[PDB]
Ligand binder design. Sequence first.
Ligand code: MOO
Ligand code: MOO
Ligand code: MOO
Ligand code: MOO
Ligand code: MOO
Ligand code: MOO
Lengths: 222, 222, 222, 222, 222, 222
Amino acid sequence: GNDTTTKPDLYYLKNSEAINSLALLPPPPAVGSIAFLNDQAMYEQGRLLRNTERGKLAAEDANLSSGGVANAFSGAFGSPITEKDAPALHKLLTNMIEDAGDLATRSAKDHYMRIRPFAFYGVSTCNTTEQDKLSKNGSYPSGHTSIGWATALVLAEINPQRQNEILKRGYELGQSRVICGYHWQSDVDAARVVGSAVVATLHTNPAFQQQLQKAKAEFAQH
Amino acid sequence: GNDTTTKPDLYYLKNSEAINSLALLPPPPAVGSIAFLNDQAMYEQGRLLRNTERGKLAAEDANLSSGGVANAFSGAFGSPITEKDAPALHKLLTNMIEDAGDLATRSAKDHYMRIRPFAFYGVSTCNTTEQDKLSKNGSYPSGHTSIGWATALVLAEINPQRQNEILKRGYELGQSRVICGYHWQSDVDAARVVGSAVVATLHTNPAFQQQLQKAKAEFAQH
Amino acid sequence: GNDTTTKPDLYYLKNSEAINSLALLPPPPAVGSIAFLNDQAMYEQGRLLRNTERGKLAAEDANLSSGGVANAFSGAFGSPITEKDAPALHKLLTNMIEDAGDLATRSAKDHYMRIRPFAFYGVSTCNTTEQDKLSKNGSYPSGHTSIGWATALVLAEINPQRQNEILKRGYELGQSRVICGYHWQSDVDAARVVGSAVVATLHTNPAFQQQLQKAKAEFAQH
Amino acid sequence: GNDTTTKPDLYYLKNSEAINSLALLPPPPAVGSIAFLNDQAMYEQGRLLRNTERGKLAAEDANLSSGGVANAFSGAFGSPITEKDAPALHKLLTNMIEDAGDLATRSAKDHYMRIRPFAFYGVSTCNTTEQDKLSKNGSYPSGHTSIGWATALVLAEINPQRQNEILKRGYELGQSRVICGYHWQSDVDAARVVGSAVVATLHTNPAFQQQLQKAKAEFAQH
Amino acid sequence: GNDTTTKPDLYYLKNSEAINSLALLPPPPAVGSIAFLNDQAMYEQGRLLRNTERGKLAAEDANLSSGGVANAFSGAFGSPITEKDAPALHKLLTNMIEDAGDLATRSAKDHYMRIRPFAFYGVSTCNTTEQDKLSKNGSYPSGHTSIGWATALVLAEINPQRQNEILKRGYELGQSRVICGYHWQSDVDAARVVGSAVVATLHTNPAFQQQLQKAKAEFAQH
Amino acid sequence: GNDTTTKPDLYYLKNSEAINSLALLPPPPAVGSIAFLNDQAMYEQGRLLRNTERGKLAAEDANLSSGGVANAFSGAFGSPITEKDAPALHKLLTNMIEDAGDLATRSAKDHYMRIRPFAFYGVSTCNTTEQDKLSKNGSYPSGHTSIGWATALVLAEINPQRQNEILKRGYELGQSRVICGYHWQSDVDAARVVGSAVVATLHTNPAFQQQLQKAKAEFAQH
Ligand code: MOO
Ligand code: MOO
Ligand code: MOO
Ligand code: MOO
Ligand code: MOO
Ligand code: MOO
């Protein structure tokens, strides 16, 4: 799959620096397990939440694909994160996205091919934009959750004084996937183990440690 | 409670610079939910494991406070983290035991004072040593857990070529609690969240920065 | 809402003299608890029953408002409660439909606005007639239920030699909701509590006293 | 079993006026049913509550056997209910006790012989006074719950202006049995159907309708 | 009932020699039990495999009716069972089918009249050929699983060089009904008991005796 | 392994002809599944009957080892199976025991090495005679249930006037292990598959052939 060598504006890492989720993450809950039963319970809870504000916020949370992530984190961060208002931070996030959404979650996703609620129950997610595209994507672990958690983790280092609010968005971001219908609760949960793992590799990657430096200081006068 | 102001040999952060564990994390599984039911079967599973190698390891992953966490990883770091071999590493790892163990959890540990399983069942742990001091300590979320992960995201940014073994052991240091009857599965899972959120905060700390730096320089050596 | 002041043809009590359904009753089973899981298997069970005699009866136990509750019992009262045969009985039974149906439940119905099952599942009821008017009405606790029981404790103190049949039918008038997909088992159970608590209050009401008296005198007749 | 003809100071009814619980109540949850699983869940929840105030109040709630019931309801009722302060009410309650605790619950109790938690798990209730005596008593339905509910129902007619507080004690009384270890939650729940049923028969029994009259007026000047 | 006195080419035993499945077998799980909760989970896991190599096999396994059974064992038997290759054989398998499928399931089936998963969920089976005919034929126990097992045991007593094989197929041959959705895992497990039982009553019939020998013989030079 | 080449009076088949249970059988439920949750519920229901007519029978059923099996079928067979009444018979039953009990369970057993309920809960069985010996003998599948079934099928092919009977006993003969607490319901259900399978491999052995005839013969005048 891609990596920095082919999509250097969505990754800071090579497939070789990737975290092996397959080896690090426990198998997903099986069907006929009590844990799955809870996944199913979490979906229904989630699904009934959909026609609530938390629901609307869940649909408009499936969108992070491009710059959207820095959009989802605007309020929590405090200052707005736009290409125009904070492009150093805005690039930092935009660049690390697929490292979080694809590298960190690839081995397991692909190895297990867990199915997805919407496909399991045969009912549409709350935001069908990427549905048909993800419909063939391993459900476990979740990409957005990994992204949400890693970004938030990264943002918490820039604006520590606002980490609780940030971190919560990060977390809340993963949960929106449960409400929406794209991931079972276990997908969302495992995603955070991996998503915290990449932010570690990223702290060793020079390209990241420099954009982080530019994002830090760029906000430190803004 | 304490922090870097009262015992700066185990904290970097101040009660002020800590994560709102209670605000970030969801509430533990309640008795009577499919969730707890799973926590239970988990405990059973861990129990039957106690008398096998894993149980053996589970036995040992209980001692850390002294900086045994450092020695828990020495094996998967490919180099031994000790006070005589990796002074900068070893110190770094110990000055933050409590930033990750107490500050990262304390807020929600106290607010839920959830029942540990050795106490919920009467049966004792796989390691009774701290069983006492802990019986009157909230179960949610796990502190050993949030220290195995925290101390892993840090040893993995210091030794990326071996991040998968590091990260795995840190994940395992947390499973042990579950096999030792010390924590419910849910306490361990929820602990990796705060565990990962503290490192973000740590990276914003001069004292941690410094030593993390020295740790890296010195690493080129041992 | 209404009461004996706005529509005294269906109430005896005033919003003031009503039970705190919301304060007396525990919270409904939440999605994700073994409790709801049972509510579910119950619904399934009721569903498969719909196409049998019980289902047949379940079908009919849905119409009451007009005073069909009176006619629901006529069979188990051994005498027919009608407007032409037991005027005092029939009136008594109807002037309190709403003391038991609305006032007895309203408080917690609104506060939980719990999801009925035809709506939780998409599938429609065994009797679609009131399915509309009710879809936007809290499910917890059941009002038909709290009227089948209330109207039974009253017909059983009026005809004690037949109290077991009376009480059984009133219990059945409530099970029907469960078989009709109108209410969850838990809505029905919790409804017998408020259903029974209203009669206590009714016995303290002059208007109810009077008619209850006339009902008894007249009973010696038909 | 006894009745008014042999224990006229604990019953107002004859075995012939008794409500047939066996016929009116649904079978109790079986072992291997989801409902039982919830009973078990409710016990553990209950048991962990025992070393709480609600717990202490649960132990000192197992005592209603003689005049105790009117004691349990003192606060909720407002005025004290003692042989010396309100002996007309105090007799009314003392006399109707076994009608509620034994008649209403006899056919089912004896027919099913459901076992009890304390005996099921082999651990002692919170108040072992009647343990060995009840240890051989059908667990389903519960006597105290029937008593608690019926008294409270009856008390609510004397002091309507305080029914919510009364009724709650009534309800809370049944629940204390779950916390204590004598009854499964299903026992406590079914008990209230029957307990509301007897208060109906009692409203047809002359001896009751006169003591009620004396209790009403005796409080209506007190 | 039907049998050899009315359909001698699919039957060997008469009704007088049918085995009482109703009696020898426990009742099927019930909506409400924990085992029906697992009947459902296995229905779900079955669904997920309908479109895989296994689901195709399942679909084909739905066809035993006429020689389908022989042709379902050929791969496992080691050679081909055809009316013109293993004639003696093919003949045997052909006339016992109904013994194992009808006779050895009628009582349980007819009495219980259990809902099939497909009718339960309202979801076409995986090989609708029979779905209608069987849509109103009791689910508990599975007649296809019986044949599968019955015949697998008789063939094992013929070609013992590969019993593991001939047996493993017979086993799976019943599982297919769970994947196809015609039966619940429980009707399948049950079906094997009556399935093995009839092979006993069959060793009791002279005709079966005759044939089977013949078949065993022919296996010599073949 | 042991067999007829080392213990010819309890064996008929050699190891080379043992049936592969490991292979022909699904794995035993696992702590975490819904079916092990039901394995437990059946363990609990088993316990409750230990002190009843059935529990005594269960206790006695734990003794087949030597002629216990013959003496466990005598009531159902219709006559007495004694070394001096139904000698030919008694002999057969006596030397197949190990085929059905050891040979037809070794692989599954040895491989899986499943925890017995008694060891699981730490609660003496209902007939501790064997408990020690078996305390470290894999639980999945049940060897006593195999014998029970195996032998019940061979006897049915002898005294077909009462197969329902001879069979119902064999069935129960395996259930006893669940009430006694030596096996989980699941090891019992599994055990019957390998139990019926061996009776096939047995009809393949000339010796079994010889004996069984003899036994069938003797049943003529007896
Ligand atoms: O992208 Mo997920 O893997 O649908 O969050
Ligand atoms: O220290 Mo825990 O909180 O026993 O892992
Ligand atoms: O009226 Mo309900 O509240 O549909 O029984
Ligand atoms: O008296 Mo119960 O039947 O222990 O409440
Ligand atoms: O024939 Mo079944 O009864 O659909 O296996
Ligand atoms: O012999 Mo078992 O393996 O205890 O039935």
